[PDB]
Amino acid sequence: TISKNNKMMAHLNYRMKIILQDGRTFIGFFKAFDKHMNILLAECEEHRQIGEEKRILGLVLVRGEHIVSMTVDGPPPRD
Amino acid sequence: MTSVGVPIKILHEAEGHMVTLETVTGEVYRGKLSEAEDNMNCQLAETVVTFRDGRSHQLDNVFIRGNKIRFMILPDMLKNA
Amino acid sequence: MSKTHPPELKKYMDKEMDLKLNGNRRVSGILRGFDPFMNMVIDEAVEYQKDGGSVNLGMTVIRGNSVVIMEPKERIS
Amino acid sequence: KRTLYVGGFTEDVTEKVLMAAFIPFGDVVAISIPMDYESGKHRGFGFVEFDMAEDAAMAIDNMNESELFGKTIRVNFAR
Amino acid sequence: GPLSILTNSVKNNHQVLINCRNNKKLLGRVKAFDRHCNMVLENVKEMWTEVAKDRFISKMFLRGDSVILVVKNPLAQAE
Amino acid sequence: HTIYVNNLNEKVKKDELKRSLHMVFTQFGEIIQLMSFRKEKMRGQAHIVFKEVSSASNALRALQGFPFYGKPMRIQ
Amino acid sequence: ADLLRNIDAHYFGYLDDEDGRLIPLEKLIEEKNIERINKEFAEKQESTVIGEDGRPMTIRHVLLPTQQDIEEMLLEQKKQELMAKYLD
Amino acid sequence: VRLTTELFAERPQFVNSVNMREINLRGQKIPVIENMGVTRDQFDVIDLTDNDIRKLDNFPTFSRLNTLYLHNNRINYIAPDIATKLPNLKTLALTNNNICELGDIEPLAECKKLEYVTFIGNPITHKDNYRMYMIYKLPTVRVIDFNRVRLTEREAAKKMFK
Amino acid sequence: KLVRFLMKLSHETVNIELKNGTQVSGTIMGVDVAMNTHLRAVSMTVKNKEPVKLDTLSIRGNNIRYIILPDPLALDTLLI
Amino acid sequence: QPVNPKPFLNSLTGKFVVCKLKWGMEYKGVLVAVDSYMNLQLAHAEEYIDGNSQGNLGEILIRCNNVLYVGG
Amino acid sequence: KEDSEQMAEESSTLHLKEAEDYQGRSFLVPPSFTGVNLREDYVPERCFVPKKLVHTYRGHNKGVNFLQWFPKSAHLFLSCSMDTKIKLWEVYDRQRVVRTYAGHKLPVREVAFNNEGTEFLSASFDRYVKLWDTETGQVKQ
Amino acid sequence: TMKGISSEDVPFEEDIIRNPTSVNCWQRYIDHKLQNKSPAKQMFLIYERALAVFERSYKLWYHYLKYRESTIVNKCPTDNSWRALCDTYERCLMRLHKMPRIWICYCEVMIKRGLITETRRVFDRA
Amino acid sequence: VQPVNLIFRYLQNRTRVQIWLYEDVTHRLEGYIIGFDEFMNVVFDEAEEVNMKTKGRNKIGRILLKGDNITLIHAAQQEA
């Protein structure tokens, strides 16, 4: 996925999960790629641990500098 | 010719609407965006800052340097594409 | 390719603004300085301390990379 | 890239006709046709802005030299 | 230059003792070089206080951006 | 649209004055432009800007002599 | 340009299909591909008309409800939930 | 004219002299407040002055809203649940309306964070116990009808009601 | 050249340490020089947290504090 | 007139200097170094913290970013 | 010609429309239509190969015969012509218009600013130097 | 079954009847479903209904054809579901035969089926 | 005005300036300056460092301070 162009295209139409520098976790689709690792994250939800909390979010573009870990799962989307 | 800057093209599309961003100091900003640079330096017109406890403040202008910051969130309108 | 030029800093210069420093220190100052390194030069500035009183800052030099946070008091027209 | 220069259309081609010719390759959100005030007619050229540069590439590669009203219309990158 | 120490230390097959900014110490033999002092560590023993804990690592690779401080022990025995 | 105001009541706080006049002027019309100060020489004076000449006269006649913080304000 | 004086009836393929001996050879390569994709995957109305090029093709026209067949279905549905909400 | 979702886009959305974020819906022939939810509480100030609003009700739940201006409207009823909709409302000016009863202030009194109000021009000023009732019901309020509350009036007010 | 080791390092199983005292174990499957790290058949162990298993993982290599390498890997041939 | 750091260092080169790290640790060492990153190298170094000696050290490798002092 | 003759003859005229843009700031010293450095040093880097002509500046009827630079910048240059007019020009790959100065009975030969820069003195074959204010566009010495 | 309505498409399906001539009403109908991963037979129907009204809309044809290819991707190219995809391209081309993207995609789809004898003929038509 | 020329004005008059350090650091420096370059490297002389843990001062003679480590520079004032 990261940087390499061909990996980006293969991973599309999958559900993708992100873990960041502040320990919060995000899950979002992407159909954009910058080889310097900038992607557009859509239809995202975040989970917070105090306890536990969930929040509804707006659409996001992500900078690779903050991402600590990323994993891919889930059923294919539409289109 | 030019062939570079796909997020910047999206960043240009993100201009004129409202953006959310976080800083290395840990607080969150919400602001309307119309400035972009190749070195990722950016400036926001109209801005609100809110802390993760209960403090919030309003800022009329904020300038952001692209090399000592956490990343910004772009408007939903980009889903037009 | 093409790239881009520096912003129109002249539109905002010579106004009075507050500057913020790491560790929640506050400075209030008038600004008139610019360079390609984007350093800053401040004059007639005052500091507001978190654990004491106040001190006056006389003609200040700032390395551009460290601090750039502004809240302005004069609305742009 | 997202801004196209459009050229070579016949005097019959109005802005909606270009709208009908360019949304074939992506979302078009505006077209403009500068009109020559001395003749009271257009100069045979118009601009198209796309929401995506990829769409503009599928609109240059597949509209440039395409036939409209039997004339080869030219679509190109605004310099 | 500073590489003089690296070259002479490496050329004499020495080990390096490393101490970290907070919790951990490392001991290693070296085979990597660049202007950024990236290192590959061999015959590694990891010890840190979370009670005393001990773990042995045969081979390790250390990047030069997460940089840590080096201590020399010449009376220690060679391999 | 510029007027000079003098001899205002000294007890109104800066934001309170800004807030008090803002509620006063917004009821009269869609006018929101004011600058007020509270330092020793600056006290008792403020600068206000009107959107239109017609709204200014109605507001001026109403504010002329209106009791505010126990004192009748005057406008020139 | 200068290609336009060279485009002709041969370019559009009007003069290249009287032979037809290609089809048996194409069939041979075609079936090996079918088995090849099967092996790679193993581990993982109508109408008939003379088509564009003169050869028969089949068109699978969709049959689907028009708006008049479905604006009435939602109508009956919404009246039931409105009366249910009025009583309950 | 109607307060539909399209009206919110066409009308000005602007930042006021106190750096708060305001949307303009003044005088838009609004008879009943509705469809405000499309804003999704993104505005600090809502200005509905000069409209034809007949009742103060149907507000969505807003928490960012600091100041609301409703001068000169036609409000003749206030919903009791207004405190649940606008709990964080700090300024509410209802000047020149026709609010007639202390009971109308009770929904407004449930808004426990309301601090500044104006009721000049309302008939309620003539009503008996108009001044003393507010002092008892609203101890957190700092300014009323462009007037302050004396410390002695609370002692006098407490003496009257006790 | 050092660039060869990052590109050649693949298919083996490694243990990874992250700045937050966090431990990861994953096998590598990638062919590129830019140090982009992609893992398969992964187990995850965050500091002061229970172990969890992951089917695939990708990590920004610059964030990684240090990577622990398997016993038979003769690192010398990959570095040249 | 003022002097650039490199000729300034030349007068200082080989002499005795005080060092401190951004993390709050202090060191004393002999220095010979010139490089584009402006790194430092110390040999046979004696260690002081809060002015009190802890240990005598050997050869040490330290990145330029964390070190910020040189003077005597 | 003398002051009484030259004033009735309209020897200087104003034609600029963009005298202000977003602020009432000066337009000669700062390059207000640019984001580049407002004041510049003498040497940024080691020299490089030249490139291309921007435009011919077509419109005027006669030849050009001296060039001078503005203090601390290269965005704006001043030109002297045998047509007895003095004009300013923008050079950073731009083609916008600037205001015209004129007042000489014979061709201009040389120009020097005063060190403050708001005035310039011009030498002409008519044996006079006239004093212009660049912002005002008028003569009075 | 071919019949059925739900509380969450009552609004969108009604909106299309009062607004019979705006593509965006079908987009508002489609788009929320798109988020909501839900049966393809419903999605094919909503697309074919939209493509019955606005038969020259490239966007809906392109997105529909790519969506058919997207969901059928799990079936082996020998399957009749890939034949049905090709029959959808033929119906698309009855309107959009002057857009190379439709022809280019159609050719790539024939290549993914591995056929040759009339993959060539699709190219000859294009 | 710009920092390099202003540093020339400080050093020519030998003004005493205060410098602070960035990231996770807690130290204050009070000193006179005699050094210049376009890279804003600083030669610090006749300096005194304040220890914020104790509000004590130590006197320091001639040190070099790298410009990238430097935050703000301004003419020092008393703190107690």
Side-chain angles (χ1 to χ4, degrees):
Chain A
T1 308
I2 313 301
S3 288
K4 208 179 185 181
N5 300 49
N6 68 336
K7 299 299 185 179
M8 280 286 192
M9 293 301 294
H11 281 275
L12 304 188
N13 320 310
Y14 286 77
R15 197 75 173 158
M16 186 260 292
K17 180 176 179 177
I18 321 95
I19 301 98
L20 302 186
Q21 192 168 118
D22 65 343
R24 292 180 177 174
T25 64
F26 301 82
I27 301 179
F29 293 128
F30 73 104
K31 288 205 172 186
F33 51 93
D34 152 52
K35 65 170 180 284
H36 307 73
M37 194 60 198
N38 287 187
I39 62 166
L40 189 80
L41 199 74
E43 302 183 30
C44 185
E45 296 183 14
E46 70 174 49
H47 312 71
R48 303 168 177 193
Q49 307 301 326
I50 299 176
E52 186 171 53
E53 177 175 275
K54 173 172 288 192
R55 194 178 182 207
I56 297 172
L57 302 179
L59 190 145
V60 173
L61 183 131
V62 187
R63 181 179 174 90
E65 183 186 333
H66 210 254
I67 299 180
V68 180
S69 299
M70 177 190 294
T71 184
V72 177
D73 62 8
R78 243 67 113 295
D79 297 1
Chain B
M1 295 306 290
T2 285
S3 185
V4 74
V6 186
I8 288 294
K9 289 175 176 178
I10 305 175
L11 186 62
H12 286 305
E13 290 289 345
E15 293 197 319
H17 284 74
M18 62 295 296
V19 299
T20 303
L21 66 85
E22 301 189 53
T23 53
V24 296
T25 44
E27 73 284 348
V28 189
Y29 294 74
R30 178 56 147 64
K32 178 266 187 179
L33 167 66
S34 60
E35 186 73 287
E37 293 189 59
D38 176 55
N39 53 40
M40 308 88 61
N41 296 347
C42 296
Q43 206 269 9
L44 309 184
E46 304 162 23
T47 288
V48 179
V49 61
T50 295
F51 291 77
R52 295 184 178 196
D53 50 10
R55 175 179 290 275
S56 301
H57 293 287
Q58 300 83 13
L59 303 173
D60 294 3
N61 293 105
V62 171
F63 182 87
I64 301 100
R65 185 186 170 103
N67 75 321
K68 290 294 184 183
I69 52 158
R70 280 182 178 174
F71 75 95
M72 317 85 79
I73 294 170
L74 301 186
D76 312 61
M77 121 283 278
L78 297 175
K79 80 191 300 182
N80 282 285
Chain C
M1 289 71 175
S2 183
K3 216 168 292 206
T4 194
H5 54 59
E8 298 185 337
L9 299 172
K10 176 60 182 176
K11 284 158 55 172
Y12 311 105
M13 197 171 297
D14 294 310
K15 304 303 177 71
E16 197 193 319
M17 57 174 66
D18 284 6
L19 304 97
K20 306 184 71 175
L21 306 176
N22 287 81
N24 303 316
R25 279 78 64 86
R26 182 180 177 191
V27 168
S28 197
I30 295 176
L31 184 154
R32 48 281 198 92
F34 70 101
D35 55 7
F37 304 106
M38 296 293 293
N39 297 300
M40 179 190 305
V41 177
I42 296 295
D43 198 8
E44 307 194 355
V46 175
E47 178 180 44
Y48 299 85
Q49 303 191 339
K50 270 300 304 176
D51 58 354
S54 286
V55 293
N56 182 89
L57 314 177
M59 198 67 185
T60 302
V61 169
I62 290 174
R63 183 74 180 102
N65 68 340
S66 68
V67 167
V68 51
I69 295 293
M70 303 167 177
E71 181 177 1
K73 293 152 187 163
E74 299 166 82
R75 196 173 183 85
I76 307 301
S77 60
Chain D
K1 289 193 177 184
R2 302 193 322 253
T3 310
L4 306 188
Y5 168 88
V6 187
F9 49 80
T10 65
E11 296 151 36
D12 321 272
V13 176
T14 65
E15 188 192 324
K16 295 185 182 180
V17 175
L18 294 187
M19 194 73 167
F22 283 87
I23 207 172
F25 300 126
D27 278 66
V28 176
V29 167
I31 301 188
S32 175
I33 302 185
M35 295 185 180
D36 171 62
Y37 185 78
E38 293 179 32
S39 61
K41 295 181 172 180
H42 61 65
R43 296 177 71 184
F45 73 85
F47 300 91
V48 178
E49 184 175 355
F50 277 85
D51 196 40
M52 295 293 287
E54 287 68 26
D55 295 358
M58 295 185 293
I60 276 163
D61 287 1
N62 304 307
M63 303 279 296
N64 186 35
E65 297 197 328
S66 72
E67 295 162 42
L68 195 66
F69 270 91
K71 282 199 179 184
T72 299
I73 64 154
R74 190 176 192 197
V75 190
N76 273 315
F77 284 113
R79 294 187 179 179
Chain E
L3 308 181
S4 308
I5 281 179
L6 292 178
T7 50
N8 67 39
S9 303
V10 169
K11 285 288 183 178
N12 207 359
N13 311 70
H14 292 309
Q15 278 197 136
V16 298
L17 187 85
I18 318 179
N19 66 279
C20 306
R21 217 178 314 299
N22 187 285
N23 213 158
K24 308 215 185 186
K25 290 185 293 184
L26 306 172
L27 180 73
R29 290 181 174 84
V30 195
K31 46 174 177 178
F33 39 83
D34 63 4
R35 71 169 203 167
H36 291 161
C37 305
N38 290 305
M39 295 198 294
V40 170
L41 307 177
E42 185 162 51
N43 299 152
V44 179
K45 193 181 182 178
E46 175 182 12
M47 67 291 294
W48 79 104
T49 54
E50 191 82 305
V51 67
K53 292 188 174 185
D54 186 359
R55 184 165 65 172
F56 175 80
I57 296 98
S58 55
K59 298 176 192 283
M60 173 78 88
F61 166 78
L62 180 68
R63 200 179 158 82
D65 47 10
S66 174
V67 75
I68 48 178
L69 194 148
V70 184
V71 179
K72 180 183 160 189
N73 296 85
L75 83 175
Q77 294 81 3
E79 291 194 329
Chain F
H1 309 296
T2 303
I3 55 156
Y4 169 68
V5 187
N6 71 80
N7 204 45
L8 303 170
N9 194 319
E10 300 178 12
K11 297 184 181 179
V12 197
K13 296 176 178 177
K14 290 187 181 185
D15 294 347
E16 185 182 326
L17 180 61
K18 186 169 182 178
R19 285 170 181 165
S20 302
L21 292 174
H22 179 204
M23 293 162 70
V24 168
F25 278 77
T26 201
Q27 172 272 165
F28 289 120
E30 201 175 53
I31 300 149
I32 312 173
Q33 183 164 4
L34 179 149
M35 294 187 179
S36 65
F37 314 103
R38 207 169 184 259
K39 295 183 180 182
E40 183 176 27
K41 294 186 180 182
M42 316 304 185
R43 74 194 201 269
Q45 301 155 77
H47 288 78
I48 303 180
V49 190
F50 294 102
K51 189 192 178 191
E52 282 294 349
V53 179
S54 57
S55 308
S57 303
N58 286 344
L60 187 150
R61 279 191 276 94
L63 290 173
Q64 191 75 278
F66 182 68
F68 177 88
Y69 277 77
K71 293 183 63 179
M73 73 168 72
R74 295 188 188 88
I75 301 184
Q76 294 191 0
Chain G
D2 63 81
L3 74 97
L4 268 61
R5 55 80 196 214
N6 216 38
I7 302 292
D8 59 18
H10 181 71
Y11 178 76
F12 291 108
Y14 292 117
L15 309 183
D16 79 345
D17 71 345
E18 305 97 317
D19 188 317
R21 87 186 78 189
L22 286 66
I23 285 87
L25 288 71
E26 295 185 303
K27 171 65 179 81
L28 289 181
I29 305 304
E30 178 166 299
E31 59 197 286
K32 303 315 295 308
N33 286 346
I34 291 162
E35 308 313 302
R36 199 227 67 79
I37 61 172
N38 289 357
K39 288 173 69 176
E40 177 274 346
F41 185 84
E43 57 85 21
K44 296 282 187 57
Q45 302 184 3
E46 296 194 339
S47 288
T48 55
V49 297
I50 298 304
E52 284 192 62
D53 59 296
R55 297 184 180 77
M57 69 173 288
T58 184
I59 304 159
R60 296 198 160 85
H61 304 266
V62 62
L63 288 175
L64 74 187
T66 190
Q67 55 79 20
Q68 197 250 263
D69 307 329
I70 188 160
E71 184 267 342
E72 57 86 19
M73 189 194 307
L74 71 89
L75 170 52
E76 287 128 16
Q77 180 76 25
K78 73 181 182 181
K79 298 326 282 193
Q80 299 151 19
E81 69 94 349
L82 285 185
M83 60 81 58
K85 175 269 172 182
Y86 290 163
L87 308 181
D88 281 6
Chain H
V1 185
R2 295 183 181 179
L3 190 53
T4 73
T5 37
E6 300 71 52
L7 190 71
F8 298 87
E10 289 193 320
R11 292 297 93 99
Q13 301 174 16
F14 76 104
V15 172
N16 61 18
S17 65
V18 295
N19 315 313
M20 278 198 290
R21 196 184 184 189
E22 183 168 335
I23 183 165
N24 184 350
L25 294 168
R26 297 177 79 112
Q28 305 303 292
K29 308 187 181 182
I30 302 165
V32 181
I33 300 175
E34 62 184 347
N35 301 317
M36 303 301 291
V38 74
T39 64
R40 295 181 178 190
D41 204 22
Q42 79 191 357
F43 300 108
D44 304 298
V45 186
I46 292 168
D47 189 7
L48 282 159
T49 304
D50 308 317
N51 284 284
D52 301 293
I53 297 164
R54 298 177 183 169
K55 297 188 288 158
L56 178 52
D57 62 355
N58 203 46
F59 262 97
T61 302
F62 294 145
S63 301
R64 185 172 171 169
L65 186 68
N66 173 284
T67 290
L68 177 56
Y69 293 143
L70 284 162
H71 320 267
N72 315 330
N73 279 281
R74 310 184 194 278
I75 298 171
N76 64 5
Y77 173 86
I78 306 182
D81 63 354
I82 192 63
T84 73
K85 310 306 184 183
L86 311 182
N88 293 343
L89 186 71
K90 294 200 167 202
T91 313
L92 176 65
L94 291 168
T95 325
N96 310 315
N97 281 267
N98 299 87
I99 301 297
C100 293
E101 292 294 338
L102 304 178
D104 301 333
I105 99 163
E106 304 289 319
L108 304 190
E110 299 298 347
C111 302
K112 310 302 173 180
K113 303 185 185 177
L114 183 64
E115 287 183 29
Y116 316 99
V117 293
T118 68
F119 290 119
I120 281 163
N122 290 259
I124 193 175
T125 62
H126 305 307
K127 294 291 190 172
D128 298 336
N129 308 319
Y130 149 79
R131 185 169 175 86
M132 299 300 182
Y133 192 82
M134 288 186 71
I135 292 162
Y136 174 72
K137 192 70 202 194
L138 311 177
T140 63
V141 169
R142 298 168 78 179
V143 189
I144 299 168
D145 298 338
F146 306 129
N147 291 274
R148 205 168 187 170
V149 181
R150 295 187 178 192
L151 178 142
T152 58
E153 290 178 305
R154 293 192 176 279
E155 292 195 330
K158 287 179 180 181
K159 185 176 178 178
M160 175 188 295
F161 299 118
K162 184 176 181 181
Chain I
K1 193 170 178 175
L2 281 302
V3 300
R4 286 181 171 183
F5 159 67
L6 299 175
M7 80 189 190
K8 288 288 184 177
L9 181 66
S10 54
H11 307 287
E12 296 299 333
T13 185
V14 298
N15 304 307
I16 285 167
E17 183 94 57
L18 303 177
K19 298 185 65 167
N20 292 8
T22 290
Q23 292 183 108
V24 170
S25 298
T27 80
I28 305 163
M29 200 290 292
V31 278
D32 59 343
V33 70
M35 212 187 176
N36 303 308
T37 295
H38 304 109
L39 306 175
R40 65 184 181 175
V42 175
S43 69
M44 165 67 76
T45 36
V46 182
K47 185 164 175 167
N48 301 338
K49 294 185 183 183
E50 299 297 339
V52 298
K53 296 291 187 174
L54 293 172
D55 54 349
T56 184
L57 175 63
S58 60
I59 309 175
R60 179 177 184 261
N62 296 349
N63 290 18
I64 299 172
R65 193 184 289 168
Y66 43 73
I67 304 170
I68 292 161
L69 302 164
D71 305 353
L73 181 57
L75 294 169
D76 311 60
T77 189
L78 307 184
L79 291 165
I80 296 161
Chain J
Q1 67 179 0
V3 64
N4 310 111
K6 301 300 186 177
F8 183 86
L9 283 164
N10 293 349
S11 79
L12 297 191
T13 296
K15 302 181 179 180
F16 187 80
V17 301
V18 299
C19 294
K20 186 167 187 160
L21 311 189
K22 79 169 73 196
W23 324 114
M25 311 305 185
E26 290 179 14
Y27 294 89
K28 306 187 184 180
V30 71
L31 172 64
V32 177
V34 182
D35 62 1
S36 306
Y37 277 95
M38 306 192 292
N39 303 296
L40 299 177
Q41 56 166 13
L42 304 172
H44 58 266
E46 307 281 359
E47 179 172 65
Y48 291 81
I49 300 180
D50 301 343
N52 296 310
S53 179
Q54 306 300 307
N56 60 301
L57 304 181
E59 294 184 326
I60 64 178
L61 167 67
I62 318 179
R63 205 75 167 82
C64 62
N65 65 347
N66 71 280
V67 191
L68 66 192
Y69 263 176
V70 65
Chain K
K1 277 175 176 175
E2 195 157 35
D3 305 338
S4 57
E5 299 294 331
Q6 296 211 293
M7 288 186 292
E9 286 176 14
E10 301 191 324
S11 60
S12 183
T13 54
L14 292 308
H15 300 281
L16 195 75
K17 289 85 184 172
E18 55 268 86
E20 298 187 321
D21 190 4
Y22 203 69
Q23 184 174 18
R25 53 179 163 162
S26 167
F27 72 95
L28 283 99
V29 177
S32 60
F33 300 98
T34 78
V36 301
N37 305 292
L38 307 178
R39 304 286 75 196
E40 295 175 288
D41 297 339
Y42 307 107
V43 181
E45 294 188 81
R46 173 63 164 132
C47 302
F48 301 118
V49 184
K51 195 176 180 175
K52 72 171 182 174
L53 178 64
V54 178
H55 193 265
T56 62
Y57 300 157
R58 184 189 291 147
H60 297 288
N61 305 273
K62 306 187 185 180
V64 187
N65 74 283
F66 192 69
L67 296 169
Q68 174 242 253
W69 62 97
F70 187 81
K72 305 182 181 180
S73 176
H75 176 71
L76 193 80
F77 267 74
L78 183 146
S79 303
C80 136
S81 173
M82 314 98 68
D83 199 35
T84 84
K85 303 116 190 287
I86 314 98
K87 285 202 72 176
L88 295 167
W89 295 102
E90 290 186 314
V91 203
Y92 289 172
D93 204 20
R94 283 161 179 72
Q95 308 185 20
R96 304 200 75 95
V97 296
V98 217
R99 195 197 299 157
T100 308
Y101 313 121
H104 287 294
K105 193 257 291 191
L106 298 179
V108 193
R109 180 160 54 97
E110 188 184 339
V111 162
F113 50 72
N114 75 326
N115 291 275
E116 191 273 349
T118 309
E119 307 176 343
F120 78 103
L121 279 63
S122 52
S124 170
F125 300 106
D126 62 22
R127 306 263 286 257
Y128 290 94
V129 3
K130 295 182 182 71
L131 181 66
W132 287 80
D133 297 342
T134 57
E135 285 279 331
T136 299
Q138 294 187 357
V139 173
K140 72 315 182 191
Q141 254 287 34
Chain L
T1 183
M2 58 69 63
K3 50 166 51 67
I5 293 293
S6 73
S7 74
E8 62 270 33
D9 38 41
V10 166
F12 299 96
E13 188 71 72
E14 189 272 340
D15 190 24
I16 289 162
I17 273 68
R18 66 166 194 166
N19 293 306
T21 197
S22 62
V23 170
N24 193 70
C25 297
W26 291 94
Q27 298 292 359
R28 290 197 297 231
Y29 189 18
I30 286 164
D31 287 336
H32 99 73
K33 282 185 182 283
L34 301 183
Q35 307 226 331
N36 296 5
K37 46 259 166 65
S38 87
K41 293 290 187 177
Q42 291 197 8
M43 293 308 307
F44 295 168
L45 194 67
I46 294 168
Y47 271 117
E48 292 280 7
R49 288 176 66 220
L51 293 171
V53 186
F54 301 108
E55 71 179 309
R56 303 98 178 180
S57 63
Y58 169 85
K59 184 176 186 175
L60 285 171
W61 271 116
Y62 177 59
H63 294 179
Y64 174 51
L65 287 163
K66 289 290 170 189
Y67 175 56
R68 287 266 275 187
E69 192 188 340
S70 177
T71 190
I72 297 306
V73 84
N74 293 331
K75 270 62 178 178
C76 185
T78 308
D79 291 350
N80 193 51
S81 55
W82 281 86
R83 188 176 292 112
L85 175 62
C86 298
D87 298 339
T88 312
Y89 275 98
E90 293 294 349
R91 286 191 293 111
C92 180
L93 288 166
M94 287 166 182
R95 300 96 180 140
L96 298 180
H97 61 291
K98 295 299 182 184
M99 315 318 169
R101 206 74 223 162
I102 303 302
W103 280 113
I104 288 162
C105 293
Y106 188 21
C107 297
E108 291 181 341
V109 161
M110 291 293 292
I111 289 162
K112 284 181 185 185
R113 291 210 291 159
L115 268 49
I116 288 154
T117 314
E118 79 296 70
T119 302
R120 181 168 56 81
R121 299 178 182 158
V122 172
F123 277 114
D124 285 337
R125 293 176 197 152
Chain M
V1 67
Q2 280 176 342
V4 178
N5 302 82
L6 183 47
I7 285 164
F8 271 104
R9 292 178 182 188
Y10 296 158
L11 73 90
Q12 282 174 110
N13 298 286
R14 205 182 186 86
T15 310
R16 185 181 173 107
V17 300
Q18 191 192 52
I19 296 193
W20 304 349
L21 303 172
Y22 210 61
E23 301 195 340
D24 188 7
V25 179
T26 168
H27 302 109
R28 291 189 177 202
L29 311 178
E30 300 174 44
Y32 301 85
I33 289 173
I34 33 164
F36 74 104
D37 63 356
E38 298 193 324
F39 309 110
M40 208 205 81
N41 289 298
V42 168
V43 174
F44 224 59
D45 200 7
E46 304 186 74
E48 292 168 296
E49 172 176 305
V50 190
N51 186 353
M52 313 310 297
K53 298 183 180 181
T54 61
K55 305 192 189 190
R57 288 178 177 82
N58 291 88
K59 191 174 180 288
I60 298 173
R62 198 159 292 182
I63 64 160
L64 167 73
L65 179 58
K66 294 171 184 169
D68 294 351
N69 301 107
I70 294 172
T71 306
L72 182 148
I73 313 178
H74 82 103
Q77 290 203 336
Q78 296 291 345
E79 293 197 59

